[PDB]
Symmetry: C3
Subunit: 229 residues, 3 copies
């Protein structure tokens, strides 16, 4: 069990499945999402990369470096690709899984979805998640989630735009989206995303600093002590 | 052009047009600049009230250098620029509202960034729109091209207040605003300019990016078809 | 000291109290708050610095002290403990900065937040860097331009308040359930890293204080401030 790809009209569906149901962002999952974006980009008809979970879990992030680098690179590709990456959340989004939804162009979630940053419990900081989470929600919702470690409901997450829309069925919301999206030329989506990159204060240096700090932190005695147990 | 009405502590600049699109023409952009000159020379004027007519606020540009320069003045002028929206605000018209100190709207108002449909990016609108709403609401509007209701625009502060009558809200805000010295308005606005990460260099980037895109093959094709 | 300190399980409570009820931030009160944080930091069991007001006022701002105020807010952003501003009533001017600089703002429904500085020809220079980080640009700008207070419910819409509750002490006790599971070294690492996640720096504080000291000596401020104090 891993990333299942299904082609639908104008959509490439990338369904995260896992043997344990945690839908962790293993190197295998990150490569598979990377190759899904490759497939989606190579199709002149594909307008959306639909990112989703299964069994009440969207994604719980990296399991316990090389992972952090490919996670950061994959989130950066989401920000530049000339197609709409739509995170369809139906359940648990935790840690890196929050960053994976936050990096998408749109987050569409069901009412039962929860979003959390439990990293501080293991002596970690979600270094890799935060630049893209802060861009989406502002500094305070991201900070309050990191500090508290408590999950936030989809309706709550919609108040600070971590969720773009709470709906009964995210697949139906993606089909609604396609009506307006199929009218846009992929070159314009690419230009639109390139210009928005310059509309925020974070850079390629932010990614580098995020990875440096994440690896420093995971080697610290408190993170070491907690992760072992 | 721009119909101008002097009221107590207020200069009302009403955008009017034959087609009802209330497009920002070079002549409309010139008149709004002159309205601001009038507003600034009147020691008693505290508000430049910007509004549309006939269910349309403003539908953007018909140029980009004047539009950027006018929005920049809105952020500097030592008076409150209040955009009173009662209907449609699209593309450049969203930027003219977003650059105002306050956006006061009726429930029937809608805000949209339809630029992508014609192969464009709203380059000139986004620096000021992103400062007002944050990154994600601006980005979702531009990617989707779909209009947002005034109530929804109020959730991410594209609208400051949804009210039945914006002229009544401007009269209510005059109660506290008349008590402030124009020099304090000028100092507040200047200081707040340093409280965000955008500069005057953002304005030249926007203009260069828009002028490149407007001559791009997708934009040339779609715009030729829109006008023919 | 104008500040009452009380030790509770995992908590240091710093209650602002004043005979004039304004809970002003004087040199003496800012020093007491800095010493309180020194005490919270020296106690390994202390996880929260609980900052609150009394008798319907949280804090109405400053009584130089501007540098002390800016340095205290900066400490709040790095200290390896959770600073929680429990608001029950009036937070004005500098008082808004003192709350917005806390990790969490927990308020009762009757609470109001305002930036009346433009009334005395001032700009809330020292408040705005931490306020804008918390609420974004527009809510902070509308508050300063209008000078009109905002209810706790409306302040929660733009995260100036993290939660509106009937009892902020009960909400702090609820926070402790998860906070006590975190190592203080992690809180400090989290806060340091979050410092790198915004565009403001140490330079922003010095700019803020230079601008405020210029404005307090400007003709409009000198006249209105003189009018007020006389």
């Amino acid at each position: 069990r891993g990333v299942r790809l299904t082609a639908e009209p104008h959509v490439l569906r990338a369904t995260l499945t896992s043997p344990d149901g945690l839908n962790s962002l293993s190197g295998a999952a990150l490569d598979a999402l990377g190759a899904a974006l490759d497939r989606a980009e190579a199709d002149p008809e594909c307008r959306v990369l639909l990112l989703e979970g299964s069994g009440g879990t969207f994604c719980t992030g990296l399991d316990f470096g090389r992972g952090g680098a490919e996670f950061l690179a994959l989130m950066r590709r989401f920000g530049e690709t000339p197609l709409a990456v739509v995170a369809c959340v139906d359940g648990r989004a935790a840690g890196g899984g929050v960053g994976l939804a936050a990096a998408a162009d749109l987050v569409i979630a069901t009412e039962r979805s929860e979003f959390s940053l439990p990293e501080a419990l293991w002596g970690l900081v979600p270094c890799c998640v935060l630049p893209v989470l802060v861009r989406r929600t502002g500094f305070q919702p991201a900070y309050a989630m990191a500090l508290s470690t408590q999950p936030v409901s989809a309706r709550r997450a919609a108040d600070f735009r971590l969720v773009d829309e709470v709906v009964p069925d995210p697949d139906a919301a993606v089909r609604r989206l396609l009506v307006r999206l199929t009218r846009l030329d992929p070159a314009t989506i690419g230009e639109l995303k390139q210009y928005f990159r310059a509309m925020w204060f974070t850079t390629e240096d932010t990614d580098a600093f995020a990875l440096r700090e994440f690896t420093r932190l995971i080697d610290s005695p408190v993170a070491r002590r907690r992760i072992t147990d």
